[PDB]
Amino acid sequence: FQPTVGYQPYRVVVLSFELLHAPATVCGPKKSTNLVKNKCVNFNFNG
Amino acid sequence: YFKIYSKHTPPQGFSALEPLVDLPIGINITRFQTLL
Numbered sequence: 001f002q003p004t005v006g007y008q009p010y011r012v013v014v015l016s017f018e019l020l021h022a023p024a025t026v027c028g029p030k031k032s033t034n035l036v037k038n039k040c041v042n043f044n045f046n047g
Numbered sequence: 048y049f050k051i052y053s054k055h056t057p058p059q060g061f062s063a064l065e066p067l068v069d070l071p072i073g074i075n076i077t078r079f080q081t082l083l
Binding site: 021 | 071073
Protein backbone atom coordinates (compact mmCIF):
# COMPACT_ATOMS: atom_id res chain seq x y z
CA PHE A 1 0.00 0.00 0.00
CA GLN A 2 2.99 2.26 -0.88
CA PRO A 3 2.51 4.79 -3.73
CA THR A 4 3.33 2.90 -6.97
CA VAL A 5 2.10 -5.18 -11.51
CA GLY A 6 -0.08 -7.58 -9.54
CA TYR A 7 0.64 -5.66 -6.33
CA GLN A 8 -1.40 -2.66 -7.50
CA PRO A 9 -4.25 -1.81 -5.11
CA TYR A 10 -7.57 -1.25 -6.85
CA ARG A 11 -11.02 -0.16 -5.64
CA VAL A 12 -13.67 -2.86 -6.14
CA VAL A 13 -17.44 -2.89 -5.56
CA VAL A 14 -19.86 -5.82 -5.82
CA LEU A 15 -23.52 -5.32 -6.74
CA SER A 16 -25.85 -7.98 -5.31
CA PHE A 17 -29.55 -7.26 -5.71
CA GLU A 18 -31.96 -8.50 -3.03
CA LEU A 19 -34.98 -7.82 -5.24
CA LEU A 20 -37.11 -10.93 -4.60
CA HIS A 21 -36.70 -11.17 -0.81
CA ALA A 22 -39.61 -8.69 -0.61
CA PRO A 23 -41.74 -6.43 -2.87
CA ALA A 24 -39.62 -4.15 -5.03
CA THR A 25 -39.15 -0.47 -4.18
CA VAL A 26 -36.10 0.72 -6.19
CA CYS A 27 -36.38 0.99 -9.97
CA GLY A 28 -34.73 2.25 -13.09
CA PRO A 29 -36.13 5.42 -14.65
CA LYS A 30 -38.65 5.64 -17.50
CA LYS A 31 -38.16 8.33 -20.14
CA SER A 32 -41.31 10.33 -20.88
CA THR A 33 -42.42 12.09 -24.06
CA ASN A 34 -44.27 15.31 -24.83
CA LEU A 35 -47.97 14.67 -25.32
CA VAL A 36 -49.95 15.41 -28.48
CA LYS A 37 -53.70 15.94 -28.56
CA ASN A 38 -56.63 15.69 -30.98
CA LYS A 39 -54.91 12.85 -32.85
CA CYS A 40 -55.36 9.09 -32.70
CA VAL A 41 -52.31 8.03 -30.67
CA ASN A 42 -51.09 5.03 -28.68
CA PHE A 43 -51.01 6.34 -25.12
CA ASN A 44 -49.23 4.87 -22.10
CA PHE A 45 -50.27 6.73 -18.92
CA ASN A 46 -48.51 5.30 -15.85
CA GLY A 47 -48.91 1.81 -17.32
CA TYR B 48 -48.60 -2.80 1.21
CA PHE B 49 -49.74 -0.94 4.32
CA LYS B 50 -52.58 1.44 3.47
CA ILE B 51 -53.83 4.38 5.53
CA TYR B 52 -57.08 6.24 4.82
CA SER B 53 -58.43 9.10 6.90
CA LYS B 54 -60.69 12.12 7.22
CA HIS B 55 -61.14 14.74 9.93
CA THR B 56 -64.40 16.64 10.20
CA PRO B 57 -66.40 18.90 12.56
CA PRO B 58 -71.99 9.73 15.49
CA GLN B 59 -74.92 10.02 13.08
CA GLY B 60 -74.24 10.99 9.48
CA PHE B 61 -72.35 9.61 6.51
CA SER B 62 -68.74 10.39 5.63
CA ALA B 63 -66.38 8.90 3.06
CA LEU B 64 -62.70 8.46 3.89
CA GLU B 65 -59.98 9.52 1.47
CA PRO B 66 -56.76 7.52 1.10
CA LEU B 67 -53.56 9.03 2.43
CA VAL B 68 -50.54 6.78 2.21
CA ASP B 69 -49.34 3.37 1.04
CA LEU B 70 -46.09 1.83 2.33
CA PRO B 71 -44.34 -1.03 0.43
CA ILE B 72 -43.00 -2.71 3.56
CA GLY B 73 -43.66 -6.42 3.02
CA ILE B 74 -44.17 -6.96 6.76
CA ASN B 75 -45.99 -9.79 8.51
CA ILE B 76 -48.37 -7.93 10.83
CA THR B 77 -50.64 -9.28 13.56
CA ARG B 78 -51.21 -6.63 16.26
CA PHE B 79 -51.48 -2.88 16.76
CA GLN B 80 -51.32 -0.57 19.75
CA THR B 81 -52.11 3.00 20.76
CA LEU B 82 -49.74 5.87 21.67
CA LEU B 83 -51.63 8.27 23.93
